[PDB]
Design an enzyme around this catalytic site. Structure first.
Site, short mmCIF file in Angstrom:
data_model
loop_
_atom_site.label_atom_id
_atom_site.label_comp_id
_atom_site.label_asym_id
_atom_site.label_seq_id
_atom_site.Cartn_x
_atom_site.Cartn_y
_atom_site.Cartn_z
N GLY A 11 35.23 -7.86 14.35
CA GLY A 11 35.99 -6.67 14.85
C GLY A 11 36.26 -6.90 16.10
O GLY A 11 36.12 -5.57 16.82
N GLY A 12 36.47 -7.82 16.68
CA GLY A 12 36.83 -8.23 18.17
C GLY A 12 38.10 -8.29 18.69
O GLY A 12 38.32 -8.67 19.78
N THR A 13 39.10 -7.92 17.97
CA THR A 13 40.68 -8.23 18.28
C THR A 13 40.99 -7.07 19.10
O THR A 13 41.98 -6.99 19.95
CB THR A 13 41.33 -8.17 17.13
OG1 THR A 13 41.30 -7.02 16.51
CG2 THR A 13 40.86 -9.48 16.21
N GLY A 15 39.93 -2.98 21.37
CA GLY A 15 39.11 -1.99 22.18
C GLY A 15 37.86 -2.55 22.50
O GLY A 15 37.57 -3.51 23.30
N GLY A 17 35.21 -4.05 20.75
CA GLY A 17 35.10 -5.38 20.34
C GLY A 17 35.61 -6.45 21.16
O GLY A 17 35.08 -7.25 21.57
N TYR A 148 32.92 9.53 7.27
CA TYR A 148 32.65 8.28 8.47
C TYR A 148 31.51 8.60 8.89
O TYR A 148 30.77 7.99 9.32
CB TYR A 148 33.73 8.74 9.43
CG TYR A 148 33.75 8.09 10.74
CD1 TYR A 148 33.93 6.72 10.72
CD2 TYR A 148 33.07 8.44 11.88
CE1 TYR A 148 33.83 5.71 11.97
CE2 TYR A 148 32.72 7.79 13.09
CZ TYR A 148 33.33 6.38 12.96
OH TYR A 148 33.12 5.81 14.20
#
Lengths: 237, 238
Positions: A11-13, A15, A17, A148
């Protein structure tokens, strides 16, 4: 200062990340990163090119996790840091929660994370570490975020157990707990008001904590590190 | 006085801590509806209690059966003062041996099932009433072989806190008991005798007392946890 280090950022695409990815890159680390959305993955490849390996992958899909495992092995071969960032939420009172919304949040935030780790762990070098991105909601009661909050709390417990089981392989497992991070507008302003420090955090502030735990906290395992402006620290007013 | 006029539902009340809690509720004069999965265990409860309790076979993991339970409870009891969730399955294995099957079933019973059981049964809870969850010492810290169980229980505890916050306007308190080693194979009870600071397992009844205290006496307590673990989760060295 990150020379020779290999990192995977799930999930590095976007913010936090992406902030972590940026810092890893500037420090000279080899990075593989994933992301659900393909416009993001393309945007990344535009920005970084051959500097990082971007890979479209749904953390919730156990088959895609398998592809990821092969990809990582063929790309990096062995890793020093596995950073689990991805997370989704759906804001609704507990009595309005459906099975689908329940399933969706746990599939991404907890199950997908657990099996992504299970698949990638054998690549992690001795001395390496796993860093989970949790949330300030992993403790306490926050109306409208039952699923959540619970999904993140589950994640923190996994981090604890992994920390215990991975001891003999000398692998540290830690978590960061972001509060309100400015990376929807009604949410930033809520964050401004209730956060004791009276502002939102930055994605970079979260990244600094991730990389500290990853590379400098060499005697820290099973721990949590708050990046929340004091929100989860019981500071009155 | 003691629990006369009180109505309780005990999810997973056919054995151990659930059963101990039921026994005390009945002893105190409360109306009890309990559920269980094993038909045999239930039949035994029936022999022991009779019409004193309404016993039901019900799968906490099956949302359809949860619906049916919602109608049966609303029919037999009408309104309840206590909802006690005593559900828990576990599978011991290192994290790298957990199958999607193992993962799913532990979370389906321990977390998802509890959540929707609560979601369906909460409208029956009257003002001044409460929900008590049975968690576990494993809901904090890292216990090798119990990754899924601990995670499922930690999720449960988080639900308790959010329910506590959301149920405030209705005057419904929400809390959790965290049992340690409770003697209800022998290699586990023996481990309990060794690593528990108090050097013994607890009893189901001790867990029941804490549950009913939270239920009816802790009227200014919500969002809280009460340990029944012989000090195990309390960071007592040696």
């Amino acid at each position: 200062n990150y020379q020779g280090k290999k990192a995977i950022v799930i999930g590095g695409t976007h913010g936090m990340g992406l902030a972590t990815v940026r810092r890893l890159v500037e420090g000279g680390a080899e990075v593989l990163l994933t992301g659900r959305n393909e416009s993001n993955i393309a945007r990344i490849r535009e920005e970084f090119g051959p500097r990082v390996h971007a890979l479209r992958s749904d953390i919730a899909d156990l088959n895609e996790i398998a592809v990821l495992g092969a990809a990582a092995g063929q790309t990096l071969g062995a890793i020093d840091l596995l950073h689990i960032n991805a997370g989704v939420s759906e804001l609704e009172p507990f009595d309005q929660v459906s099975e689908a919304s329940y399933d969706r949040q746990f599939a991404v935030n907890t199950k997908g994370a657990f099996f992504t780790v299970q698949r990638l762990t054998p690549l992690i070098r001795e001395g390496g570490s796993i860093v989970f991105t949790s949330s300030v909601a992993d403790e306490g009661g926050h109306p409208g975020m039952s699923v959540y909050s619970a999904s993140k709390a589950a994640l923190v417990s996994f981090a604890s157990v992994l920390a215990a089981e991975l001891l003999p392989r000398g692998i540290r497992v830690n978590s960061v707990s972001p509060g309100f991070i400015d990376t929807r507008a009604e949410f930033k302003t809520l964050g401004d008001n209730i956060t004791p420090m009276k502002r939102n955090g930055t994605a970079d502030e979260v990244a600094r904590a991730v990389l500290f735990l990853a590379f400098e906290a060499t005697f820290t395992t099973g721990a949590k590190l708050a990046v929340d402006g004091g929100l989860g620290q019981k500071l009155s007013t």
